[PDB]
């Protein structure tokens, strides 16, 4: 969370840019709320269709619903590859 997020931020910004000890803290806190919010929401959407657990489609729908639809493409391919390695060993 403190280590892997610094690599995420360095990977997203120009290799020559920089982030203050302050900005990186905010980003990390934000990543946390983001995750709680998305789960909270995905949980909500899952009950609106009144089914027991949260599917990957519920999270995929909550993301497009929260305006983070640019995410869904990559996440679906990621989900495709995941489902494959699982159906093997």
């Amino acid at each position: 969370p403190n280590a892997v997020i610094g690599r995420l931020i360095k990977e997203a910004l120009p290799e020559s840019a920089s982030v203050s000890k302050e900005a990186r803290a905010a980003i990390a806190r934000a990543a946390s709320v983001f995750a709680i919010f998305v789960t909270s929401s995905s949980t909500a959407l899952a009950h609106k269709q009144n089914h027991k657990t949260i599917t990957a489609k519920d999270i995929l729908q909550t993301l497009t619903e929260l305006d983070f639809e640019s995410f869904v493409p990559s996440l679906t391919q990621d989900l495709e590859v995941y489902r494959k390695v699982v159906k093997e060993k």
Partner: protein
Amino acid sequence: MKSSMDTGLITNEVLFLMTKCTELFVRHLAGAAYTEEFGQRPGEALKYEHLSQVVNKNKNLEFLLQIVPQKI
């Protein structure tokens, strides 16, 4: 009802997707804050002000208003 508390379990497939998109969000957030302030100018210093600025100027980042205040 102590075998039905174990209802609504989070699956491996879900931990995965949740982790993958939180990383996407971190990268999205960092990068949006930078572009929105420096555009395509390189070697710049992203300060706190920029992050509160993108949270202010973005509707999907609305939920971060309380967690990323105007003044640190």
